[model samples]
Target chain A: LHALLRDIPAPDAEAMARTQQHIDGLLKPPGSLGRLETLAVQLAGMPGLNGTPQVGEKAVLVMCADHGVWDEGVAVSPKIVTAIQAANMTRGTTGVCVLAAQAGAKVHVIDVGIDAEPIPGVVNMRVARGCGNIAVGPAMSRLQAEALLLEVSRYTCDLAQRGVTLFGVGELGMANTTPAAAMVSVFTGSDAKEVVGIGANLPPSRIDNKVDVVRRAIAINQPNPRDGIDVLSKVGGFDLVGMTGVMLGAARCGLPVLLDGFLSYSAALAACQIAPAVRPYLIPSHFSAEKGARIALAHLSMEPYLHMAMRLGEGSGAALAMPIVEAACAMFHNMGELAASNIVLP
Target chain B: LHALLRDIPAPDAEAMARTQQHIDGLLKPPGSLGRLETLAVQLAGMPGLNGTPQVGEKAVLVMCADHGVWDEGVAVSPKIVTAIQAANMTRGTTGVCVLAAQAGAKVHVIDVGIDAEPIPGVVNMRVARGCGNIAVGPAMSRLQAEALLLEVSRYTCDLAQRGVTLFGVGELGMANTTPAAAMVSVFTGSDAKEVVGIGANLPPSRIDNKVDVVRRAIAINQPNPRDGIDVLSKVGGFDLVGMTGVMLGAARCGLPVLLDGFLSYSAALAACQIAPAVRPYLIPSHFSAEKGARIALAHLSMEPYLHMAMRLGEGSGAALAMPIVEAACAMFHNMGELAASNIVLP
Candidate 1:
């Protein structure tokens, strides 16, 4: 964890300024491309970009785990579904896989803490069989949380080394929204009711129960809001922590991180708390339909590019938004400049 | 014009129902993909989709023209830039062209009414050399407006016949926003100040002048709000009418139309007013940064999918959003079903 934090550096201001000037000099009017130009400038400033941002190759890291909170009946699906979906992702048959293919990005399913035996093709880096019930006790030990972050960081850096220019983070974990909402409540200092939602077909009557569980978890664990490890170990699931690690590793590699949705936002909140510098490296993919997403994103001071009201996790939103990033890069690389195009302005 | 309107039919309600049911049966949660599922359902309902929306082949019809409003200095660039950009688009080097390439979609540059002599490669369907000043008098004769729409309709239908399933509409016309804002004001019952913006870098100080132009145009022309051709003839540029035609033609062919930004929104408003059935065939691509886009889109009761604040009008936003449409279709066609996958839920 320390190595990951130490390796990550601030964006290059000089590179960003140069990229902005480059975009302004494109054939279009100054700032006419709006957020696309801003995104290109941000990409140029990323650590490894060296004033040239390219999004040709991309991958989404799907971290799979099980939350013990499922024992509390917080979600609609069984805990085993996490394992099922993770395996499906490996076959390129899940929501993330289909959309990732469209964006020309690959989906890598990583097993972090499923409550079942390891699947055939998923990357095996399991921290445990599953997390403890956060509503009753701590989710995991601080060391276990730190281990998940460290191992995934190395895993992500390895992918970065193998020519991945952009990284997306998503997850498959049953009842995981309980832990995610709890973490958001802790990080943003909002009440459970404010951050909780009827995730994945939970009935409206059960929403209050979900909120209550989140409140109970926070009260019992008293995780330090400033320290991501403390928060993750206390009330966060392995998948959320793994996503947090993905952000850390991607930032360390000087690549931009595409956040999927509310779960990704919760992890992003933890990642930012762990290392504020990772903030700039983060790019929000879509506005999640989850109730807490707005509050969580606002706390990060980041706005998503797509507002499709998408709540499907598993990196679907990230993959869907990849082309926007690619288009931004295209604008910087392919558009004609005023002087070079020789279209005199009157 | 009558044939085009008569040929256009309402979407297939049964097809939309079947598509929605198909999406609901997918492995993911019900409506979890949110707007993507909604978009897929809408696409399936489109005329030619036959309950199986396919977004493989896309084309952006960039209609280029010139507006006499430039004679009043309502914009930063000269009117000749329209011809320059039309030529540049044919070479595949403009904003829309570059992004369209990224989306794997083709960009077709059609000159409907450019002020200068015809560029060699641009498709020639010129209605006139340019429009008259809407601020002073009618932008075009009513008959000329009808002819512009009819010609573009044939042009769009020809492309549709060649197997283009998705159509995007954008334009290149200097000072065109004045007429668009004027059209918006008349249609939405909004005041000139409410619909006018500093389009394409009109100085803030000159905003009042632009608003005055829109108000003056409306006052002098008194365009009938319910009559699209009257409004177009009185206050719309040739490119605006051409875009209106593209939407009309695409709807007649049962293909979905992707709207770029404010200019596209203004044209979409006119199309819907002309043929209310066209409303269902329209898909908004982005939230343009121009002041009137929100108002215009709201009046149509449609929300844009992307909110990159892009204002580059050469169909850039529409091209940038194509992958999202593709991903939505992929989800419908590729994702595994719960029963088919045989992942037993407990």
Candidate 2:
């Protein structure tokens, strides 16, 4: 097995400044395009000064796993559906697959921790067949958590080597939200009940149970806040660990990663906890429907472009934002300047 | 000029319901996709049953015009930029051109009321060489107003016949915000001060003067909200009239039209006044960085997809949204159902 790397490069300061200048020079009010302008600046920092700065060649890495927390009945869906949806993802039958097709992006599903036989058309890279039930004990051993992160980092690096510049991270795991909220609570110092929400459309009756599940998992784990790997080992699911790896790997490869919904943002906080520099490479694709999405985003110091209340993972929200981000880069480089139009800003 | 027609077809509620059911069945939580799900339902209603609801063949009709209200010092940019930008649009050097190119959509510019000279590239359909200064009196005569609407209707209908199903309406008229705010005032009963903002980054000193211009125009014209033509004649510019025609004609032809920011929303208010049924065919592309955008959107009974603070109205915002709307519809039809994955929502 390959050893994990610990370095993610900082974005080019000059490139970001150039991008801001380009945006300011355009015939609009200063900061009128809002988060989009900010997104473009971060995107411009990727691919360097001499690079042609485009958002093409987008790929979504959806890490499918089975959370051991499923045994706690935190979510409504069965753990077996994790493998089922992972298999379906290969056939382009999921929301992320459909939305990726629309954005001219490719959807790549990796079976990170499915409790099933090796499936066709899905990349199999299982990490101990999923984590242990965090509500009862540590989700995974510290070594297992680090191994999953290294694996996902390698997964993203392989795609990057294949010439994918723009990346989107997604998840496919049952009862993942229990650990996602628990992870957020540990990192953001927020209450488990404050960050927990009904996942996969759980009944109102299930919320209290889900909250308790998270509270129990965190209380049982007592994950240290300083160490991201420790936090993942204690309470985080394999899918989230994999997603954090995607962010770190993309940042290391000098690329931008589009994050979807609350699940991805939870990973983003962990990624930030691991390497604060990865924050610049990550962009929230949309504001999620979950109660603590804003809390997560605020912790990341990033703003999403769309606020469509999308809660589905599978990289669906990121795929929705892919083309919009592409267009912003296009306009940034292609549109005429104010002086060229013989106009002056107020 | 052809006379204005008032009959716009009703939305296919059956098709919309089918679309919603399909969205609800997808491997995500109910109401998770939010406005995106709503957008797909509307898109599905168009093209009817047994008809594909894809948002391909996207075209942005950027109506280039001149506003007589520029003389009131409500804006900072020169009036000549109207025709200059119109000329640049033909060279594919404008924001709409760049964004539409990214979406593989066509950008069509029309000179509905540019004052300086008939420019190459943009379709020449000048309406009385621009509206008369609204601060002084009516922006245009009733006949001129109706003729401009008829012209835009013909433009969109001809494009529809040419196989364009999705339309985006944008405007390029200097000091147009003065009239746009005035139009919203008539429809929403909002004060001019409450609805006016710095368009194209107008000087801070001009906000009061701009608000006064709108107030005086509305007081002088006393536009009858019941009569759409009277309102346009009194306070609207040619670009607004042209954009309204796009909404009306798109509705009549059973196509979906994407609206830009406050300018487009203001025109949407006018279109609603003309044909209330047309509201269903219109989709708000973005929540504009303008004072009255919320008022106009509330009036239309529609919520926007993007809230990126984009106020540059060249169908730029709508062009950014066309691909997103397309993805939503694509997901609606293509995503695997929960039962197919051996799962059911709780």
Candidate 3:
């Protein structure tokens, strides 16, 4: 809890300036590297980005829980599936695990609130068994929301202690998109109908139900736009708030986080609202097709790196992209400068 | 040349239906995997989606050349840089080489129209010296244009014999965006202003010049939308036309080509225009900041999978993404199915 609860330190501006100089000297066109250069520079600006942008070890931190909003008939899968998949993650059979292995990244998960029976082959830390549905009332108690947010940060600091240079954040739960969508509506001042989309291939017949349920959740929860934790306590599931916790944790440790999809985006928005300076530490991993994803990213003034049109919520997209961010750092630190490659800039 | 020049066969409808069925049953949600499932189904539908799909080897075929349009001051780097970077690729120092090595993908190069002296160590296949500037005149002759289309197809089939499975198409040239943007304009009936973005970090002072130059290239060349060959003959660089040829070859051989940036997107659009069936064969690697990338993809009704704001031209993005496509295939064939994973569907 030492640094996890403290304000994040400022990134090394001096290092970012030096990195910009080095990138300019690299053999490519002035900005020919595009977003990758900006990415490398961000890493360079951290105490680590401000300087030790290592890439050898990658870690993916996921929060698994259950969302009570499923009772509103907004989601296609049941809460029990979340527990099964969480167990599957440990066995390396879940989508994120399969994708993470391709990039040689490690997976770390927390069972913040899985409501189902014990997931086989894994231990569980059920902080709160399933968050209450916001469409009817607040999702969790004020004490629980605040305490767990800090707990999530501690979870990531543990990974940093284990040497995670770059990390990814994702959420798992049934109907979690509703809280995410509702949170987006609250933060961006948009109507639920404008940002709610069919989740899990919900047939056109079920789309309206989702929209209505999303609107109702936000209306009933009445999360304040001025308060980040207030919104988390009002409508967010453990994983969603946990996404924010991981981000804050990563920032406190001067680490970079790859945001997964809509759920992570909502968490990032919450995290930024809590601490505006943390925005630089949150990297949007990919553009999810969920309508709220766009709104969430825009609210935070961030752009995603990938647009795979992925909708799975177990950090699958971020895991798939680990190598890319790794490669960017590798070149930044190992690749030759411009003249060495015979690139004589005019 | 038999099937190479013929219309590509329609993907097997039976396989698409069956693959969708499997994807729907895969535990998480009804349609949680997003484009990955669609990509898996497409591969499954190819020849037959009924069987397992696998990725054995990856090849990245790069087209290196020069653009005469640079004479208009649209691009910053000199033509010599093209040869320098092309030379840098084989030495394992270029961004693509370092990035590709991480994914264990092979890099193949063709000096199709490099204007400088032959780069040492790299065997050259001089399709043409360099394209004439479309801003001032037609880029190439009809004989050159039609001949090279068939020639690029042969290039891919040659790789097929060498055990290539998934392939990537990327382009390299100075001021080449002028032709790509202009070609997109002709095909989409859009003005050049809407599709021209900062290339190579050209300062703000040079932006309008690029837009005007792009518009004039199309005006002077007057490429016809009706004939793909006429457009390539008029405004295409060797690499631009070359990318189309590779994609066509991939489709005919039942292989997938991960498209690089705006240049490759422009080429794929051309290939599909020539053979509508080829549209399904292209998998966009990443979105380029080049404004034309959007227009080109929409022309073909496709979307890029990644958008890390990468603007590099050496198929670096595609190479960085090889593992993702590989993992998609892995999960489609090897990961546990819903019932097998103990997911009891309602």
Candidate 4:
């Protein structure tokens, strides 16, 4: 794991500058293309391409797990939903599945920690049947957390080597948002009340209890903010751990990873803390309406380009944003240069 | 023109309701899909489709013209660049063209009112060399405006008949934002200063002068807000007029028209004024960073689902948003129903 972290190199600043200069020369007003130009530069700086990235083939890697915290009533959905959605995702019949199909991308469902019998068609990478309830104790041992992170990172690197140019990370776990918020609060030093949101429509009346649960979890675990693995072992689920691994792996391989929502943001925050060089590979897909989303994203120094008031976290936002990334690459390759054109503006 | 306005039918509210219910039943939390659900509901109510809109075959109808107000130096780009970009758009090398191609949409460049002679590969739809400078006088005679609008409306209907499921209105004219802001101010009863922006990177110092130009244009034209044609003839450019016509025709045929930026929004506001029933057929694509974009969008009672801070007005934003619309439709068609599955939450 330490060697993998060391392998993740910094983005090419020169390539990014050249990309920006190239975008400026495109036959449009300066800064007219807005975030598209910014996105193109970011892609150019990544480990893969020379000023122009081909992001045609895309995939969403979804990590499925059951949250023992579901018993605390932090989320409205039944605990079985994690398994059900995992199966649905494998069938390509979930929100993320449909969106990925629309974007001409593939959906890979991984049974990272789903608490059910072995399901057909799901990648078997379960670290456990489920994580321990963080509200009362550690979600997993440090050793288990490290092992799962390393395994998922290597899995993501293998996928990258197979030709997926762009990647997205999604998590399917009932009450996962509770741990996500707790992680955000721990890493960013934010109050639990400020980070905790009504996960998947928990009643407003129960929000105070959710906040209390997050606060209690933090107080019980006392996870070191500086140690991502310590925090993950204490409070993070397999879904987040796997996603964090994906980010680190994608960064090492030089592919851009699209982050879906608050959970993705939480995982990204953890990944960045673990390997600060992994920051450049992350592309925020949407501003999830989940309450702590902005706080977490701000900590990562990333801002989402799409804002649909969407809180669904099956990598649907990432899939929906695939075309925008494609457009940025298209613009980088296809737009006519003002300097090369006959018309001169002064 | 009146006949076309009469032909624009109201959206099927029942279909919209059914789509909402269908989306709510999808294998996710109710309202979790956010604006995607709203977009799906909106598309279901369109005239062409019963409940599912096949938006695969999309086209951005780009109207190229020259704004006489370019003489006022209200923009940074040269007037000749309009012809250059119009040519580039034909070659599929412009911002909108590349973006449309990425979104699996086609770009149809029409020479609506360019000052230059006819260019190759561009559809010959020019009304005149160009309209009179609006700051000095009316852009075109009322009869010419009426004729051009009806002609373009029929042209758009022809494209729709050829199986273009989604339509986008884009304008390519130098200093066009000057007229767009003018038209917006005239129709929405907004102050020129409130509507005018430093278009295409117009120097901040020149914005006051641009505002004055808009004020002068509105003062001289005194365009009746209730009369869409009068406003188009007096203070609007052919690009805006043609876009308005496209919106009207799209609505008449029950197809959705994606609005790109301030220019598109101004045209849409005019289209709604001309045919109030056409409101349902319009989809806001992006929240342009242009100064008055939100004000114009607010007047139209529409909010863009995508917010990339884009100010490039070439149907680029519309093209970038096409995949999102496609994803919404895909979700509506592909997502398994929660009730249909064995899993039940609550």
Candidate 5:
């Protein structure tokens, strides 16, 4: 991982310069694009470019895994559906895949770990058939978790090298929100009730049980702040490890990463802990009504572009917001200057 | 006017079918396009077409005129700026013009009537040089009011004949809202205070005087419910006359018309009175926070596309919302479907 970080391209200075020029030429007052112009400028600076960075094409790579905590019966769907939907996603038939296609974005599905063996032609990469069920012990060994992170980082770097400049992170795992909620409360200093919601509509007692399970795990693991990857290995699901690596890899490659709904946001919080600079590369797509989503975006100081009361965690929000991003790009590229029009204003 | 109505085409059944088909193919659920699909379907039906209506290549006509009521001092900008901006709009260099250009729509500025002599290059279709300043008497003579309505209808018919399938109405006039507020109260059966705001932030005394002025004019005219144009002629400003014409014209020509900000809405109310069927052809673009706008939209039972805390009255809101309309179109065109992906729900 250290070697990969060392090899990542420095920000593109030339692209930054061109982006500023284009912004000045857009058909509004200089700086009229407001926060949108600021976002474009920031993107340019990240890639070490002085002009507009070619977004080229966008894609969302979603990694799916199952947490053994589901063995405690805290999920809406059976653990097998996580692997099933991951396979469906890769076959280009899931909600995320359909929206990605409509937005002209590609979807790459990876099986970081699931209870079942990989579905043929569906899973692009696998860390293991599945990690140990977390209710009994840590989800994965420290070395295995670190290797998974490296693998995800390597995969993301390959995509960046292939000119996929805009990327969004997404994840699928049954009962994953349990760990996500735990991590969120620890990192954000939010209460469990604030970060907790009907994760698949468990009974009140079951919900309390889920929260207690998370608290107990946190208390037992008590992972150190200095070793973020080790912490994930100690208490996180396979999908979380892969997502953290993907976010870091995108940041290391100077690519912008769009953070999708709740589960991805939790993974992002974990990733940010490992590499704080990755925050600048992140664009939160929407504020899912999901409790964790609100906590996550607030922590990042980002405002979502849409508020459709969505709680479904399938990267749908990010796919829906892609057009708004396209419009932001158009404003960056097309709007002209008020000075050029020479119109007097009050 | 009767001849123009007779010449207009009925809604196209074939086009409606095509629009519904296109909507079904979008990536969301067959009906998930919701009200947006309904809007598109209605627009297609108006033009009697079976496919997407060409929106980027149409003109939204705005008519400007001054009401004599400004003699009571109810406006901020000098009344001449109304004509000045109208002329400026024809030059294609104003906020609305800028937004229209971005949406690939044209702006046709018309001087329906004003106190001043005609400005060159602005189409001169005056009902009178100006209406009676309403503080002393009814704003327009019955004959002049009728003439304005006839001219509006004629203009709309001419445009519809040119294959323009969509129309939008906007207005330019000073102190017109005083009469508009009165009209709104009459139409919605609400108290004057509920429908009126400080037009240009006039002193409370002057605003009261203006409201009284409109009340007295309504009493003097004693407008007949069956004679909608007669009522408008008795109390409406030239801008309202022209917008009413645009609505009638679009409805007659089977073109869908999007109503711009406040003044256009007042005109739309008048149009509805003339022919309730015209209501279906008009889409309220935004709910201007202006009291008149809120009342008008409520009366029409239409939801606006945007709510950006806008009260600027130069069709700016409509211009900004064009992008949203475009987005709706893109959603219809680009969003994929479950069946298309061969995904089956469990």
Candidate 6:
């Protein structure tokens, strides 16, 4: 937890001034770009760049793990689907991978911990083989969660050094909703039921079991920003810890981070509480149809770019919104000035 | 109008099958891409291309004109904003040009009979250069309307032969809402007031006057699709003829055409009655926040992509949704197959 908040950078004022000026000059009535212009300015401030800040090269990191809470039958999809989807991602068969490929984005798949041994070449950053089944007890020990966060930070920083301008975070975990729901409740001050929903079509009885497990986790964890590490240690999966680290590391490196669906947002919320500076680096791609997503985004005060009732979490929303980001960038690079076009400004 | 219907090609089944299969093989589950997948398949069916259907490098066509009905004073922005914004578009100062440049799309501005003279560098494809001010008399003579429709057919066929892949249709006519409202009423069987709104923030009395002028024009012209050329001669502006041509050209070329807000949609509603195949080619980008837009979209059973309460009609909606179309294409091309990823089939 101490490590999580250490050495966070403040926004760069010079970069923000230049970005705002450029935005103001963009032809439409001043302030017409709305949230988008604000997002650009925030991104510039985070990177500490004065002029023409760009997310030219980007990577999407997907962390994979399994929660033993699946034994409670919280998710209709088998726990094996986590590993299956992760392997698919590795083989470039997943939507995230394919879309990433088209957008010239590299995808990094990490096995923070799964029930099975790491698949060769499929899992690059494995923290542990699998996490403790949360239904029975806490998912991981404090030390393990800290180690996972460190690993994520290290990997993300390494990518930033390699010239990655944008970061997208995603996750794969069966029955993970139990932990996500608990975290959402903790952060948003909402009840578990208000943030919980059907995941993988679990039966009503199993769904209740899942909700009970989340309640228990919340009670045991008592998570607060004061001890972000302890909270994750008590209730977080390897994937959640890893995601938190990636978000922080990206912020630390002054790179913009694109957050995927519900689980990714939960991890982001926790990271923001631990280090508020990290919030400015985040770009929420879309509002997931999931109830937890609504709670998390509202808590963050971030409006999503797209909302098409998507619930699949593998960074699909981030990929879908990539073109728009590119367009925003193009608008900065292209689009002639009003004076150059001989047009009078309003 | 007869030529427009005679020019459109039938849908191709082979290309659609290939596109569908490709979507099924993408990394996500079948049908997971939602409306995007639907859009890709529909495009494939139109162009008759299986895999790797390219958006042909075609010039984007925009038609600009003025409505004589402005005499009734029913517009929010000054009539000059129409020609001014059109010129801004040519200068790449507007959203449409910004997006078009990023999408590698070229824009061609056509001045079709606006109340104003043509701006240099803006292609003058005027049918009448301007329509008759409809407050006191009919907007156009029956012969003039028919000639405009013929010109539209000729222009569309010429563009289709030039290998354009997509058509984007928009207009810039002052007080166009009067003609649009009347057309909406005639086509959808709705009352004029329901389809009317405060155009240019006109007073209620002026809005009523504009609406009455539209009704009077419709009654005087009594446009018949059977005598399409005569209809254009009687009531059409150069823009109406040009847009009708663009839609026909898109259908004739097997390219998808997107309608930009209210005026463009009204043109499509008019043109489709002249040639039914034009319906398949038309994609409504958004339900204009304009009062008449809902009735228009509802009549066509077309769902819009965005609803940001936009009233600007300089092809902004189509430009905004262009990235969405690109994202859909990327999904079609990139996603991996379920079996290859070792994932369970849905």
Pick the TM-score winner: 1
Clashes of 3: 9
| Candidate 1 per-residue C-alpha lDDT over B1-346 given as tens digits, one digit per residue, 9 for 90 to 100 | 8878988988898988899889888989888899999999999988777668897578999888888888887988876788888888887878998999988899998888898998998899998888899989998898998888888888887887788999999999999889999999999999989889988888899898898888899999999999988998899989899999999988988889899998998898899999998988899899999999879989999888888878889888898888888888899999998887665432
Q: Which one wins on DockQ? A: 4
Error of 5 at A260 (Å): 1.5
In candidate 2, position B224 carries an lDDT of 95
The full ranking of all candidates by DockQ, starting with the best, is 4, 1, 2, 3, 6, 5
Sorted into a CAPRI-style docking class, model 3 comes out as medium
Badly placed stretches (over 4 Å) of model 2 are: A1-6, A25-34, A47-52, B1-6, B27-32, B47-52, B337-346
Model 2: TM-score, first chain = 0.94
Q: What lDDT score belongs to each candidate, Candidate 1 first?
A: 0.89, 0.81, 0.78, 0.87, 0.68, 0.71
Summarize candidate 3's per-residue lDDT along B218-274 as a digit string, tens digits. 878788888887888788789888888888888877777888888887787678778
TM-score of chain A of each: 0.98, 0.94, 0.94, 0.97, 0.91, 0.93
Fill in the DockQ of model 4.
0.74
lDDT (Cα, tens digit) per residue for candidate 1, span A1-346:
6777988989999988889878878888888888898899899999776678787579999999998899887988866788888888878889999999888898899999999998999899998899899999999999988988898988898887788989999999989888999999999999889999878878898898898889999999999998888998999989999999999998998889999999999999999999998999999999999999989999999889999989979988998888888888888999888887676542
Residue B171's C-alpha lDDT in candidate 5? 71
Per-residue lDDT over B1-346 for candidate 2, one digit per residue giving the tens place of the 0 to 100 score: 3233545668787877877777788876677777778777778888522244576578999887887788888878777888777888888877788888988889988888888878876788887677889888898888887777777787787888787888999989888888899999998888888889888888787788888889999888899999887898888988889998888778877788888999998898888888777777787788898878878788887777787878778898988888877777677778778877667665
Model 3: residues with Cα > 4 Å off, grouped in runs: A1-3, A48-50, A67-76, A120-123, A133-136, A195-225, B1-3, B47-52, B67-74, B133-137, B192-198, B201-223
Error of 5 at A4 (Å): 4.8
- Ordered from best to worst lDDT, the candidate numbers read 1, 4, 2, 3, 6, 5
Better candidate by lDDT, 3 or 5: 3
Model 4 chain A poorest 10 in a row by lDDT? A48-57
Candidate 6 displacement at residue B314 in angstroms? 3.4
lDDT of 5 by residue, A1-346 (tens): 7776555555566766777877666433344334456667667766622246446778888888878788766666666667667767756655577667757788888788777876776555666666665546777888888788888888887887776878877777778878777667667877767787666545566677777777776777775545667567767778888888888888887777887777777777777777777777777776666667777778777776554455556676676556545545555554444455553322
Error of 2 at A72 (Å): 1.6
Candidate 2's displacement at residue B37, Å, is 2.8
Better of 1 and 4 by lDDT: 1
Evaluate candidate 4 and give its CAPRI docking class based on DockQ.
medium
lDDT of 3 at B85: 82
- Give the poorly placed runs of model 5, Cα more than 4 Å off: A3-25, A29-35, A48-50, A132-136, A200-206, A223-231, B1-346
Write down the C-alpha DockQ for each prediction.
Answer: 0.71, 0.63, 0.54, 0.74, 0.11, 0.32
